[PDB]
Design a protein around this ligand. Sequence first.
Ligand SMILES: Nc1nc2c(ncn2COC(CO)CO)c(=O)[nH]1
Ligand SMILES: Nc1nc2c(ncn2COC(CO)CO)c(=O)[nH]1
Ligand SMILES: Nc1nc2c(ncn2COC(CO)CO)c(=O)[nH]1
Ligand SMILES: Nc1nc2c(ncn2COC(CO)CO)c(=O)[nH]1
Ligand SMILES: Nc1nc2c(ncn2COC(CO)CO)c(=O)[nH]1
Ligand SMILES: Nc1nc2c(ncn2COC(CO)CO)c(=O)[nH]1
Ligand SMILES: [Cl-]
Ligand SMILES: [Cl-]
Ligand SMILES: [Cl-]
Ligand SMILES: [Cl-]
Ligand SMILES: [Cl-]
Ligand SMILES: [Cl-]
Ligand SMILES: [Cl-]
Ligand SMILES: [Cl-]
Ligand SMILES: [Cl-]
Ligand SMILES: [Cl-]
Ligand SMILES: [Cl-]
Ligand SMILES: [Cl-]
Ligand SMILES: [Cl-]
Ligand SMILES: [Cl-]
Ligand SMILES: [Cl-]
Ligand SMILES: [Cl-]
Ligand SMILES: [Cl-]
Ligand SMILES: [Cl-]
Ligand SMILES: [Cl-]
Ligand SMILES: [Cl-]
Ligand SMILES: [Cl-]
Ligand SMILES: [Cl-]
Ligand SMILES: [Cl-]
Ligand SMILES: [Cl-]
Ligand SMILES: [Cl-]
Ligand SMILES: [Cl-]
Ligand SMILES: [Cl-]
Ligand SMILES: [Cl-]
Ligand SMILES: [Cl-]
Ligand SMILES: [Cl-]
Lengths: 231, 231, 231, 231, 231, 231
Amino acid sequence: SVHIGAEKGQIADTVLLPGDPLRAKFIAETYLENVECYNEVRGMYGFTGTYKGKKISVQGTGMGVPSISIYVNELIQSYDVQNLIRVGSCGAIRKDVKVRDVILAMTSSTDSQMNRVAFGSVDFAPCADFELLKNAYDAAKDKGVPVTVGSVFTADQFYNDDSQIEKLAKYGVLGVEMETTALYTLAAKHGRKALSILTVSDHVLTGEETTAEERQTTFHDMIDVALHSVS
Amino acid sequence: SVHIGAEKGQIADTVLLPGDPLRAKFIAETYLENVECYNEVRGMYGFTGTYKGKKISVQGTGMGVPSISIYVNELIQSYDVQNLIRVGSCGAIRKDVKVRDVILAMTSSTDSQMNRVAFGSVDFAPCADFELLKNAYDAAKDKGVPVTVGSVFTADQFYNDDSQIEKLAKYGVLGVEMETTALYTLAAKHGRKALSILTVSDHVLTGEETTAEERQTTFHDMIDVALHSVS
Amino acid sequence: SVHIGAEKGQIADTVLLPGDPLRAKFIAETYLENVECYNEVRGMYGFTGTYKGKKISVQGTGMGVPSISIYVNELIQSYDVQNLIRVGSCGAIRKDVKVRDVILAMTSSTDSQMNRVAFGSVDFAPCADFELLKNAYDAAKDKGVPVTVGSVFTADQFYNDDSQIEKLAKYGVLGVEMETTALYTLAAKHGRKALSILTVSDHVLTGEETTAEERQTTFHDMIDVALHSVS
Amino acid sequence: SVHIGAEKGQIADTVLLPGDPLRAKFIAETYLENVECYNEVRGMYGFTGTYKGKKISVQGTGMGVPSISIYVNELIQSYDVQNLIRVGSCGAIRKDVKVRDVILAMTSSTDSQMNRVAFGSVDFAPCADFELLKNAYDAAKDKGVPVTVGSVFTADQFYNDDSQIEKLAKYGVLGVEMETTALYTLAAKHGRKALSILTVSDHVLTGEETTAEERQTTFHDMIDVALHSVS
Amino acid sequence: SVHIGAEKGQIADTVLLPGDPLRAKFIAETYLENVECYNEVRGMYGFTGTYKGKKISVQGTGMGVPSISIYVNELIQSYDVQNLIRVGSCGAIRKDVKVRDVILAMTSSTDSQMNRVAFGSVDFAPCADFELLKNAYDAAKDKGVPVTVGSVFTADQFYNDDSQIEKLAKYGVLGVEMETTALYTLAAKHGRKALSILTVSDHVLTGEETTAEERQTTFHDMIDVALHSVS
Amino acid sequence: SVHIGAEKGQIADTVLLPGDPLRAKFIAETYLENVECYNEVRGMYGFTGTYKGKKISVQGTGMGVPSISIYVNELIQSYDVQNLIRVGSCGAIRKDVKVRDVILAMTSSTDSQMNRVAFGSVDFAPCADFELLKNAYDAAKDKGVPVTVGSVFTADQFYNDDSQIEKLAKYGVLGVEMETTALYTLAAKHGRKALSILTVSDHVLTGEETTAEERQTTFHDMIDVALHSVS
Ligand SMILES: Nc1nc2c(ncn2COC(CO)CO)c(=O)[nH]1
Ligand SMILES: Nc1nc2c(ncn2COC(CO)CO)c(=O)[nH]1
Ligand SMILES: Nc1nc2c(ncn2COC(CO)CO)c(=O)[nH]1
Ligand SMILES: Nc1nc2c(ncn2COC(CO)CO)c(=O)[nH]1
Ligand SMILES: Nc1nc2c(ncn2COC(CO)CO)c(=O)[nH]1
Ligand SMILES: Nc1nc2c(ncn2COC(CO)CO)c(=O)[nH]1
Ligand SMILES: [Cl-]
Ligand SMILES: [Cl-]
Ligand SMILES: [Cl-]
Ligand SMILES: [Cl-]
Ligand SMILES: [Cl-]
Ligand SMILES: [Cl-]
Ligand SMILES: [Cl-]
Ligand SMILES: [Cl-]
Ligand SMILES: [Cl-]
Ligand SMILES: [Cl-]
Ligand SMILES: [Cl-]
Ligand SMILES: [Cl-]
Ligand SMILES: [Cl-]
Ligand SMILES: [Cl-]
Ligand SMILES: [Cl-]
Ligand SMILES: [Cl-]
Ligand SMILES: [Cl-]
Ligand SMILES: [Cl-]
Ligand SMILES: [Cl-]
Ligand SMILES: [Cl-]
Ligand SMILES: [Cl-]
Ligand SMILES: [Cl-]
Ligand SMILES: [Cl-]
Ligand SMILES: [Cl-]
Ligand SMILES: [Cl-]
Ligand SMILES: [Cl-]
Ligand SMILES: [Cl-]
Ligand SMILES: [Cl-]
Ligand SMILES: [Cl-]
Ligand SMILES: [Cl-]
């Protein structure tokens, strides 16, 4: 494929999708055995290893709908990937979303035009694969990892002078990130299974930061949940 | 409220929401004990009775986003309703949606302008309450009722010369009805819990009808699932 | 047809279209002779009788563009209906619209997406049939019934947090209801004749109610005008 | 005003609005007595004279929504004009619109963004003043001038690669011109009375021309009707 | 062509495009030798003469996208015009745009729907012909005429209650006029070369007028630059 | 700043903006002296060195409007960057765009919603800084580097089922990339100077590739032009 330097069979059926390629490296090296790096193009690293004797890949996506769409399209079309699980963070937009909560996104709102380009007057609501989502939910509940299931907002502008997060929060949306709408829409368009699992980076509307320690803990929880979502 | 003739406390915390008021009557009389009719305004009947010693209401909504929005807004704002569960049907738009499947909607796409009126350039993705959805899913699985969890499309035009159901089906959408986007959006806007449980009326793209017998069976399954979704 | 249980010839060339099926019943029983009920599906009653020896039908439409569109499409396509006259109410949005005025709608604005779904960048302006409108106007003037001819707004949201009625009133729009755009657009698309005749339910921007007595009087005036609009 | 060189009281309460300033000249000189030219700015002539002892003005508008909007805004705001009557032509888009028919526009569709700029998600339907329209209709009927009352389309692009006139004709729209939406919207916004009276220039969808003789006749009919629309 | 009364070869390869036909007359008579008027239709004069022994035409366009689009389309399609140079004015929307600056428009924003009608979800950015623009820039610099190169806004509404000029100015837009988007888009669509050269009529956001003397000077500068932009 | 790990003064007044961080590294190491890497966050490298004794930075942007917007916003707001020059490639959409042409973008069209989010009904046309563009043009012409000045299209979807490149090419657009609209809009919004200089990656509509050798040559030409655009 144009943006991924891998060969046939180098990428697993299941791929974890962090935004940051240095986090892709950290995940593969920390969690997986027998790791190979299959992609270095643009420094957007992808790796394959095993977790409990099963092949798992981890591929950086970059930031924003256009970047993740490139990787997701190529993973699906050129490498026949079946399960695509974004592991990332989001800015919480509600007080009831606690700093330790792991978020499972059922769906996402967006200000991307990607779906209006396809559907015009239709509002297309992307949808997580329920099997993946339920497995992740079960894995969290089994261990006592706090988990919140709901919707997120996929933003094009990290710095948005016209942000509607205040109104989105009132409609129940949990947090803002920059990827889910693309992952969910493209996976479904191709009959593959997708899920986004997210930690909280901060509360955007209070400016209130999460601490390095909190972030480390939630990151590990997210990855543990991810490594129990297929099947 | 303007469209519902009920008094304080006449409507339960939990309301089932069929589109047809004659089905509301059928549900209450067939499934509930100690039934009172609290509303006859416009013949859009609403009833309250008990199921296993717990108060449950059943309120007809009429057809289409504008009609259900009236009832949902009044139930929430004037009667403090907490759980709102649509029980209806949809036209299946995929072969893999079988005539006997009970559909739990995680979200819905729409050609209604209701959310663009509020959000403009944002595509708002409505979201089912996961607690209700999971309870319904569990209730179906416990009994062996076939259940499919995914998205639906909320149409304004039952007869639509410009229908995009072919493309929607390719993106994984299961079926078409005329209510879910409104129920989900309005419940969330007011911090209440909503879920749509749907049977298949026909396969729209093959014209292939469901039989009266199939419809009777799936209807009963839907109601049984509904009467186990709260808690 | 899918939503109307009538047989061939049971519905007249001319159909009055109240939103409330209990008002359809009231109209037919109060004004017509030799009345039969041809439809009970969903309790959305339709009746046929005679007025001065001429067949006239009265069919409830439900509330909102999607509901009336179902009935109007089926009346036209399955029953070959020629003249379709909505008889209903609207919330007045101008002081100069008096509580006793009968409104004849020349056209309607809307926040429904129904016409953008068909036309995209075009603003489609629906148009009353001038022959029906002029007959109704003549009938009102002949008796001294106060009549105001102008435009209305067809709303999807009876409860609209983003209402533009203040600006609409400044542009001369008379009142808000939930049906006209659909009736006018669908009748014209099929080469049939349509008109909406409306009474005032209240002044929305002053909250000021109309009294039961005023409403009874204007209702009778509206029906009398309606029963003189064909020919 | 910026684009009209007239002084206080030089423009009458009633102004006829042809698109072509050379037609404004022709109308005033052919139909009115005691004519003065009050405007020569940009060669967009305006004239005032009397018809049966009553002051009448005739002001060229130029072609297209932006041009007519300039003149209409200045006539209303700077010269306190009360009645604004466009007299022009349109391309017929239906066979049933005959070459000799004088068209009275109840409303107009458009591809101009002028009303979406003001209203966003609302489709604003402009509305003729019914008093002017009815007077014009009466004047035509009194003399036996064939008259057709319905809607038109206000186009921004005389040469439009993306024209929807075929679909507009199916929805009953009579003909295409480039002014009415602006005249009707701006007059109503300012509480003034407007009407467009139109002849047929050709049948756009058959290319079939109207002859010079036909055009002369219909032009005179249009002006005669116009000079009987106020009161 | 429909709106231009000229014969084959009467219009030059290069046409200057003022909005006001009386300015077209003034330009041709003041600057060119051996002038013929080739068009008087609608009083929208067009002239051809020579400048330094080379044929040059000057054609009034009227005001607004729809009017200029008519002339530009006919000049290109019926008369094979190659170079189209608008010479007009604009209202400056920034303090840094000085009253004596001659503006060369690289591109223009708009509230016209003309390009959304063609492209839907795409924002089409019109583009000046760089060869013409560079020649004009060189001609200004050679003589010491102050010149500013940047973008303008093409407005449909000279009187716009919903104007966004304040925000446009913040994004760097220089001034507002009513033509450029159409000229640039239509010329490019047909493989011809276009440029808009503009003087400042006033500062719209300070109301501060330019004086008659300033306007005379800048007008002459604009025309001198124009008569050195081809080649 | 959130995504860039640099300290005060580590980034120059002038920054080159390749999409690929490994190309940022290649540019700085190949062309500049005394190079320091100031950013390794997300592996999106940024470097500062000197070219002919003047400080120059080179910062990877990632792919797509959302990614470049993050870097451009932080460079401007946190590091006070003055001149921002994207150096990248695009897919040519016209035969007349030759494989060796260096493209200077005057403006860009887009299917990103970023500007509709800010402006709604306005089509915002981004604009290159003419001073930078002219310097780059002069530098190319001085050496005989073939240069083409015109517009590009900024795409959100590298793989777009609904691509309009065929129509865009007919309107004169040169090529497709994924960044320019954001760079130009954000630089102008903040009063900074921007330019995109682009090579041809392939002809998208003929599939016809550029060779490795051609790409190496054009890359060097682009960088040489870039290192002569300020002043
Ligand atoms: N728009 C937004 N995105 C957030 C936020 N927090 C975490 N993310 C997700 O990370 C971004 C890159 O910084 C997308 O990959 C936030 O507050 N706002
Ligand atoms: N638009 C659509 N709606 C469907 C269909 N089947 C079942 N419903 C849901 O019932 C309607 C009323 O007939 C909404 O209340 C269908 O095929 N298409
Ligand atoms: N949106 C709106 N609709 C009105 C109003 N008054 C009368 N109607 C018309 O009745 C409704 C149902 O209540 C449509 O059938 C009003 O104030 N607002
Ligand atoms: N778009 C369009 N406009 C028409 C037509 N015929 C008559 N007009 C109205 O005249 C125009 C100028 O030529 C508007 O003033 C037609 O066929 N198409
Ligand atoms: N909308 C606008 N247009 C301006 C302005 N100044 C000069 N023009 C350009 O002239 C107009 C006609 O008056 C278009 O031909 C202004 O301030 N606003
Ligand atoms: N959409 C598109 N983008 C192109 C193309 N060629 C070069 N680019 C620019 O590179 C991309 C990443 O591959 C944006 O950074 C192309 O053909 N199509
Ligand atoms: Cl690689
Ligand atoms: Cl495996
Ligand atoms: Cl992330
Ligand atoms: Cl945002
Ligand atoms: Cl908000
Ligand atoms: Cl009641
Ligand atoms: Cl109870
Ligand atoms: Cl239903
Ligand atoms: Cl549909
Ligand atoms: Cl489709
Ligand atoms: Cl029946
Ligand atoms: Cl009869
Ligand atoms: Cl009603
Ligand atoms: Cl409203
Ligand atoms: Cl308002
Ligand atoms: Cl004058
Ligand atoms: Cl008088
Ligand atoms: Cl005309
Ligand atoms: Cl058209
Ligand atoms: Cl069409
Ligand atoms: Cl002529
Ligand atoms: Cl010559
Ligand atoms: Cl001008
Ligand atoms: Cl403006
Ligand atoms: Cl603004
Ligand atoms: Cl760093
Ligand atoms: Cl330096
Ligand atoms: Cl690139
Ligand atoms: Cl594309
Ligand atoms: Cl195309």
